[PDB]
Amino acid sequence: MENFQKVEKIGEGTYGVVYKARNKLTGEVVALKKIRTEGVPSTAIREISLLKELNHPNIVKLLDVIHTENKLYLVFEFLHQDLKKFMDASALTGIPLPLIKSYLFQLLQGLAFCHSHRVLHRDLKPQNLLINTEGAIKLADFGLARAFGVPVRTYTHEVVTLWYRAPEILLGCKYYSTAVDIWSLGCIFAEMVTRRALFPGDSEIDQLFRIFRTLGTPDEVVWPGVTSMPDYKPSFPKWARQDFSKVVPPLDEDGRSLLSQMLHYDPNKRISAKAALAHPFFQDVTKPVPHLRL
Numbered sequence: 031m032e033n034f035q036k037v038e039k040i041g042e043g044t045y046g047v048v049y050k051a052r053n054k055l056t057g058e059v060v061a062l063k064k065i066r067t068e069g070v071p072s073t074a075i076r077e078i079s080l081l082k083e084l085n086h087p088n089i090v091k092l093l094d095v096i097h098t099e100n101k102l103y104l105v106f107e108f109l110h111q112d113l114k115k116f117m118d119a120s121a122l123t124g125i126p127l128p129l130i131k132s133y134l135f136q137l138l139q140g141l142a143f144c145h146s147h148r149v150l151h152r153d154l155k156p157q158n159l160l161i162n163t164e165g166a167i168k169l170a171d172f173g174l175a176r177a178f179g180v181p182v183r184t185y186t187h188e189v190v191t192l193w194y195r196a197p198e199i200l201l202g203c204k205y206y207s208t209a210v211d212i213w214s215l216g217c218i219f220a221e222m223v224t225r226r227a228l229f230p231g232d233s234e235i236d237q238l239f240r241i242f243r244t245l246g247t248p249d250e251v252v253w254p255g256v257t258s259m260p261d262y263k264p265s266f267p268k269w270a271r272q273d274f275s276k277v278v279p280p281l282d283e284d285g286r287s288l289l290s291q292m293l294h295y296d297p298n299k300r301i302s303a304k305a306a307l308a309h310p311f312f313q314d315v316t317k318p319v320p321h322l323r324l
């Protein structure tokens with residue numbers, strides 16, 4: 031727009047391209063996400079608009095919503111780096127455990143806040159987690175799959191990431207619960223620790239079977255109602271659960287215990303963000319400074 035002198039394209043979210051821009055008037059540097067379409071669910075503009083009211087240190091602030099010319103623009107506070115880039119940058123040495131712990135703790139605080147306000151993220155992934163030089167990490171993107179359903183791509187026919195999708199979504203559950211975010215965060219936690227995606231599926235069924243190969247094919251014992259799920263097939267192969275010590279080595283038992291609770295198959299047994307914050311894994315949590323090269 032003419033109010034912003036674009037600095038450059040920062041990326042390509044599942045809901046449009048993101049740019050870094052400076053407000054010629056206020057001098058403010060912000061992140062501008064433009065959403066892609068001839069109607070524009072005003073019921074969404076309303077919901078989205080509510081999100082501006084979300085204020086928490088671990089949630090990227092939504093500054094403004096701009097509806098114009100069949101295009102929707104979301105103006106967000108800007109942060110210099112996303113966790114995907116940071117993990118890639120730290121791939122040789124690994125993110126120190128105290129930093130991993132600090133990030134997980136902050137992310138759970140952010141989720142506990144959103145969830146207590148009846149807001150689900152639904153598409154958590156490293157690229158959607160932003161960090162700054164002061165050790166903070168914040169949740170970005172957000173209430174969109176709700177206020178938009180679910181597009182088949184991102185915008186430029188880009189490939190949607192399934193790696194962090196909870197099993198109930200993959201099995202066709204039509205009602206997501208806050209548990210889907212805990213699952214995604216659990217996947218992210220594991221990835222920070224091992225430096226490799228936990229479940230790198232390249233299709234919906236491959237995503238599901240990678241989950242099954244590791245945690246065991248679910249059954250009515252561990253997940254009451256699973257065999258009645260929309261996309262459940264009795265023909266699914268039945269894999270034995272793998273010892274957890276093999277999944278996220280060399281993470282200690284407090285961490286493995288917490289992860290196991292975030293990855294429970296039954297959305298109802300899956301730990302809540304609030305309960306996770308009380309887990310013993312966070313007894314010695316601190317707030318370290320990351321080595322960020324911008």
Ligand SMILES: N#Cc1ccc(O)c(-c2ncnc(N)n2)c1
Pocket residue numbers: 040041043048061063090106107108109110111112160170171
């Ligand atoms: N949605 C959103 C959103 C909001 C604020 C942001 O700063 C970013 C972002 N995305 C990628 N890289 C960097 N540096 N920032 C994305």
